[PDB]
Design a protein around this ligand. Sequence first.
Ligand code: HEM
Ligand code: HEM
Ligand code: HEM
Ligand code: HEM
Lengths: 146, 146, 141, 141
Amino acid sequence: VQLSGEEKAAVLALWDKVNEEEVGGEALGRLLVVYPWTQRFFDSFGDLSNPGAVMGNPKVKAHGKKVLHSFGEGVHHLDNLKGTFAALSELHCDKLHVDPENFRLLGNVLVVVLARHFGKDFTPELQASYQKVVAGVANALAHKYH
Amino acid sequence: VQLSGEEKAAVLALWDKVNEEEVGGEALGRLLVVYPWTQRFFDSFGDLSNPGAVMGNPKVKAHGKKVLHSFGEGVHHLDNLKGTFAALSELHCDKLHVDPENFRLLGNVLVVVLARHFGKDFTPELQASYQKVVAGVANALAHKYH
Amino acid sequence: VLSAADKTNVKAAWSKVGGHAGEYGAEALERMFLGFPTTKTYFPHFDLSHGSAQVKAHGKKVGDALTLAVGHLDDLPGALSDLSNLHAHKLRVDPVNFKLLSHCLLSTLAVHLPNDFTPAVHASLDKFLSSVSTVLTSKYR
Amino acid sequence: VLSAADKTNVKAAWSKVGGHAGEYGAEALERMFLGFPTTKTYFPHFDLSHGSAQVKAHGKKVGDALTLAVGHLDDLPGALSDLSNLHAHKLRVDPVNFKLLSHCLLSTLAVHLPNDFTPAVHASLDKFLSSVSTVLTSKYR
Ligand code: HEM
Ligand code: HEM
Ligand code: HEM
Ligand code: HEM
């Protein structure tokens, strides 16, 4: 969350190439395929049986965009990370009751999708940066669970 | 972190019956035997070969007792947890490099030792409050760890 | 529980839990709904009140499935088969919940069996509650 | 792995890598020491400097052990036996680290095999690895 002077500048340049509906749906899409117990929280999206049907799912993409768009906010607010999400921390711990460890998971499925979309530009140094940004995002988004 | 009157009062009342010496050692000893990978950070204690010998180990009782005393600090400071331990976080993430999740393990071993020690008094009511202090302590230690 | 000492510490253990399997299964579930609020969710049709007739009776089936596992440490996969379907494929229970339940199950034994719940027995009982939770989520494998 | 569909999908996907087994092995290790700092601690005697000599040489044995596991998916335990001893009993590696390297290994294939790294193949390889890890950490049983 508290990167460096060079890292922030590194994280906000690659995010200018991040395509929020494309990265969101795949990321969301891969989360539900690789970690099926999560489907439980999306029973309203209809059919989530097999891999192809999940990714083509309109409700999986549109929501994918919400998640990534929100991510964008956090990324452009690396200082007030926690507070930028209290609005959402509550939604998941109170209304939804999602387990914190699931935030850690989705951020990881998210780094692999960036890795698949940027290839060798998503260097090991850069991925390191996103892991720092991915965890604090996953945690202050659970700041209302303890 | 954010209990309530009837809870804080119940937590403290019991602590008063907690033997930091006797509970710390058992706690710390039951960590090294159940989660044997934890021995890697204690090679300076000598023989941690088998169960019988770990429990009778002086540096396992001595240190256990420091651990629990530190828990006492948190139990009397449910407001300044991130502070009360700020300089203990750095110690584990920097000089020691312990994984944050080992904190949640220890805390659970600790809860089970209380269970064993207070029996029926350690009611599913009180343990609930307990799982929150542990919640918070294990948390106030990985403050800086992302 | 994939060793000789455990199987021995497991079977040796449950031997002491004997006919309380049910009680504990129940109390363990209470300790879990109270201590880990987010687990309430898999049970809306249950009356999570203390002494509830539902929890008591479900605590029993849990107590049972465990007495069955203790008697089949050689083949947990085949014994706990159908139970794997139910949690993974059907109910789609989050794997984390299993750790939380094994935790609450060990706290319970702690309460009723202090002299029997040794550190040596405490450990094998952990690999066991773990060999179990893994056979019941393996539909994610 | 653990199922037809799943051992199929993991052997076509691993053959698409063929010669790059250790190469990726190394990058995965780099990706891991950089992004997950606390893992360096197991390698003082290694030169973790980018493109080190030790790391790439070790990246190779890792690659190798992974290749000698798809070819024995039926018996992970046998194949990777002496590898359990070394990690669990000798080095006593925390089981969390195995997740981090599996993550870092998945990011590596993805970088290098975008069109072959579909979601289903992504899922299978999460089985392969998770089941791999649960054999090197098994002496904790
Ligand atoms: C990676 C971190 C995550 C972020 C940044 C995120 C973000 C969001 C956002 C922006 C919303 C929209 C809420 C609104 O309409 O105001 C939301 C809703 C929701 N989230 Fe996530 N989320 C995350 C993780 C998770 C996980 C892991 C789960 C799975 C259990 C989850 C389950 C849900 C559900 C079920 C909804 C409601 C969607 C609907 O019913 O329309 N979230 N999340
Ligand atoms: C809530 C949980 C924990 C608390 C409250 C805690 C507290 C402490 C305290 C008070 C010290 C001594 C610091 C000083 O000298 O001022 C310490 C040291 C240490 N801790 Fe922990 N600790 C916890 C968890 C862990 C865990 C799970 C591990 C296992 C990896 C660990 C490994 C160590 C090591 C290696 C030392 C140095 C001991 C020595 O060499 O003398 N700690 N901890
Ligand atoms: C210790 C491992 C577990 C075992 C051996 C186990 C055992 C059982 C058994 C025997 C049944 C069927 C009972 C019947 O015939 O109605 C069952 C059902 C069920 N289990 Fe568990 N369970 C375990 C863990 C969990 C966890 C972790 C959760 C919650 C997070 C859970 C939630 C459920 C639910 C919702 C049902 C269906 C009950 C109903 O709706 O009637 N179980 N379990
Ligand atoms: C993908 C899972 C893993 C596999 C297949 C694996 C495989 C190997 C192999 C083949 C060796 C022996 C190499 C030799 O003969 O020198 C080895 C040694 C070793 N492994 Fe891994 N490993 C894995 C995960 C880990 C993890 C999670 C860590 C810790 C973060 C780790 C740390 C080590 C260390 C320190 C050695 C000793 C190397 C030396 O000092 O020469 N490994 N591993």
